[PDB]
DNA sequence: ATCGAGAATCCCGGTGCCGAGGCCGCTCAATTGGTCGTAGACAGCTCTAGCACCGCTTAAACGCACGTACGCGCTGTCCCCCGCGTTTTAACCGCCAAGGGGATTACTCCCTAGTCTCCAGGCACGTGTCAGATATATACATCCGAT
DNA sequence: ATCGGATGTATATATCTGACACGTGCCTGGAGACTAGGGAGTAATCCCCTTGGCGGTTAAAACGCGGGGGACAGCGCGTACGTGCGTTTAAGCGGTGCTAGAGCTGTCTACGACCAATTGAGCGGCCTCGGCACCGGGATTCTCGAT
């Protein structure tokens, strides 16, 4: 009997309970944190790769290249501001020609 | 030898709950490991902060949520501080 | 004979600059440039070849980065070209 | 030597990405003199993490710790 | 109510301190939507701390905790 | 009589307030403006007397801090006047 | 016989020697991690309050009132880069007036 | 009471070595109050995520060394690399 | 500037090759079950100190006339950069070694952790009087409109 | 340009008064020893993989030229905004008042650390088959001189 399908997550719960003890960000976690932690990282994984599948469907491919991702971060508001500082390495970017500069 | 430590087999499995007719590349799998590893290292090294503001050595899950509501900026917030907690009421009874 | 007008070419690499994925500045080029910069702060170096293609995928995520927020300090001149008062005005704003 | 190597086309090419129309004739010089900065404020953080580890080898997951660093952080290598 | 308690001249010698010649009459409404865009992004980020220690009243440091926190760390009151 | 220039009492009010180091914005005003805001996000707050002075000590260097970039776009474009195509591209170029 | 004064600096190392241990930075700390820690600490106080006494002599006071801190941090090439971020309370501003606006 | 933790007689006792003929005010002794506190919890907050990456367990002098070529720019580096080297062969040997 | 001309571009459909999917096998890390200390939950009681409120007051917001100076619009002016060709240079792909250095295991002993126990450095609570901001007349610095 | 009457700002002068610096006293946090173990240094070794060199092959940089559309400077002018006086406003400040909640202590008990054995979930290596890249000819998309 696991510890992650005792809550029913996907992320284990014996991994990260190691890296809350043994990478030093405080002494003592508590027995609910590492299961609280890996669904919030769950819920985000769950974001990017519901909408990077929009992505691979809009473009009609089957796996999920590295541009794919790219799309799917940076046309979402709500996410966006999660990642304004990273990048992502050969994504490319959006198609976005400015106003004036059309003929 | 090199024994390893990753999130590859995991990702892959919430990769097959949303789009179960499609698959994941390889470089696709080493930005999805370190995008939650920043994710990972960038809210506990929150919670780690906010604990030590207040004179106190344990991280409940009570530091972890008020840092999702710091760290998460909208509309995010709103759902992922309401999924954990979902996902404790679902292992204390158990 | 054919000969496009001046601002038709420019709209047709715009468009397909900003859907490819690869590489824009050389391989071996820009390798030979990242060692003479670091033979100054320890000599005789050894680069994986790992990390010769990662400087390649950040200097052009971050010219990529300059441009597109240097061509709005053009713009906003009424005026279609960029100039070195546009560079210099994009990083006298962000941090330099 | 190879500060030339980043040709006029190639530096053109890049800025066609970010969508602009006509560079100037000016561009190609300070584009050269503005990304020759940005590598000395990497790779002077990234020998030193070499340095540290007693390594003759700069791997790839010292750069990413030095782009981290500053606020510009890499994904697809390592984290 | 209180966002035109910030009146014209108010927001006027703010500017003659960053070094500006002539304002034009149309900043006086902009800087007003601008400004409570960042104090919503920042009380939002002090009453969370406040409501994390059990306390009904946000002291100085958690502002500070809060600035810190989006790289406009402020000096002192605390650290 | 006697009356100035326009361009006059502008250049004796930054070299004046360049010098001095108090507030701005007022107290009272400013005071009603983050009980306002405040009364959002949790109702029935009750702020210290040096936390109302600590966010009028933030703001105003964020202000100060955004006309001294928001100036350099208006040189730029050959005027000496700012308006909210200035203000508005001091945040598209910094993280809005 | 303390442990400062072995070391010959002003800055506490014992007071350190708790913060590197109860912080949790790492679990082990060396023992001479917490004196050269305490002279790097030093070597910066001592940068600026040397220059902040310049700017309370050029401008006729005896005591450092947070402006002079102002004209002292911002005027040096060599540390407005480590506090290009940072702002200081009640600090003013440099005297700076563009070109074009002169008469 | 409230006991406290400060560094404001340190400060003041660095500042009657560079002019002993001058003093400080009230709030500046809470600025450099935030200040070193800045200093601290940079430098420290650094070397520890540089012997993260190397796995292992120990901030020794070496790991504050490296940790200083890279929040201190140019001019300081130069200086507060053997500045601190100074102090701590004044160490070892009393 | 509407129709035509043509260069380029969006899908058709076959080819094929090589990297994702997938069990298989080994093995270090998680889960199970007691024990221990102890941090945090809870309560209680002092007490700072933040909110309401007056009331006299005086700097400051608010409104209105107004002349001038810059905003924005136009027009010609002219070259600097786009574009298409023809050429030269060399990046890239593949080949093919020789060894530097990364990675790991293998024994060990110095270094910090932890417990112990007294002190002395640092802080709280007084307080004396010193720099500073005060005012006030006066003088030095800079314009603005007539000459 | 140069002179003139403001107009302001800067230089020097008594007088407080509320604010730093220093004496006076404690008490809890550092210091000095003493020990045990466990990390990190040090020694030493297979092989991965970078460095380097070369031939061939061609995509791409390089240089050169015609012209056309924009950057740049100027005339102009219409409205937008500053300067100033006077006119309502409400910031501020001292001052007394009310109790709400920060701030701190003891009093028990539940909570994670720690160890220790036990076994699967996780990964390393391993072929292998569907998905992606082409590779040529249809079909369109779309700018550009003309009757």
Redesign the interface.
Do not use: W
């Given at each position: 009997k696991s510890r992650s399908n005792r809550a029913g997550l996907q992320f284990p719960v014996g991994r990260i309970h190691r890296l809350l003890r043994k990478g030093n960000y405080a002494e003592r976690v508590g027995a609910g944190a590492p299961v609280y932690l890996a669904a919030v990282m769950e819920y985000l994984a769950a974001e990017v790769l519901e909408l990077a599948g929009n992505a691979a469907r809009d473009n009609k491919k089957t796996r999920i290249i590295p541009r794919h991702l790219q799309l799917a971060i940076r046309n979402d508001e709500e996410l966006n501001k999660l990642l304004s500082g990273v990048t992502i390495a050969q994504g490319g970017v959006l198609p976005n020609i400015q106003a004036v500069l059309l003929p | 030898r090199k024994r390893k430590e990753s999130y590859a087999i995991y990702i892959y499995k919430v990769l097959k709950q949303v789009h179960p007719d499609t698959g994941i590349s390889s470089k696709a799998m080493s930005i999805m490991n370190s995008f939650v590893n920043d994710i990972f290292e960038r809210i506990a090294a929150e919670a780690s902060r906010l604990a030590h503001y207040n004179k106190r050595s344990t991280i409940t899950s009570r530091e972890i949520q008020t840092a999702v509501r710091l760290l998460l900026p909208g509309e995010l917030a709103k759902h992922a501080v309401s999924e954990g907690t979902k996902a404790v009421t679902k292992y204390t009874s158990s | 004979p054919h000969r496009y007008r001046?601002?038709?070419v420019?709209?047709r690499?715009?468009?397909?600059?900003?859907?490819?994925?690869?590489?824009?500045?050389?391989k071996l080029?820009?390798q030979?440039?990242?060692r003479?910069?670091?033979q100054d702060?320890?000599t005789?170096?050894?680069?994986?070849s790992?990390?010769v293609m990662?400087?390649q995928?950040?200097?052009?995520?971050?010219?990529?980065?300059?441009?597109?927020?240097?061509?709005?300090?053009?713009?906003?001149?009424?005026r279609?070209?960029?100039?070195?008062?546009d560079?210099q005005?994009?990083?006298?704003?962000?941090?330099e | 030597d190879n500060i030339q190597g980043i040709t006029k086309p190639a530096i053109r090419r890049l800025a066609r990405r970010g969508g602009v129309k006509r560079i100037s004739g000016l561009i190609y010089e300070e584009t050269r003199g503005v990304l020759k900065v940005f590598l000395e404020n990497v790779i002077r953080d990234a020998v030193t993490y070499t340095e540290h580890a007693k390594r003759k080898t700069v791997t790839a997951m010292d750069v990413v710790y030095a782009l981290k660093r500053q606020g510009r952080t890499l994904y697809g290598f390592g984290g």
């Open positions: - | - | 001046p601002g038709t420019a709209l690499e715009i468009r397909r600059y900003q859907k490819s994925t690869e590489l824009l500045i050389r080029p820009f030979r440039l990242v003479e910069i670091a702060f320890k005789d170096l050894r680069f994986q790992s990390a990662a400087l995928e950040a200097s052009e995520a971050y010219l990529v980065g300059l441009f597109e927020d240097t061509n709005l300090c053009a713009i906003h001149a009424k279609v070209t960029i100039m070195p008062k560079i005005l994009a990083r006298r704003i962000r941090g | -």
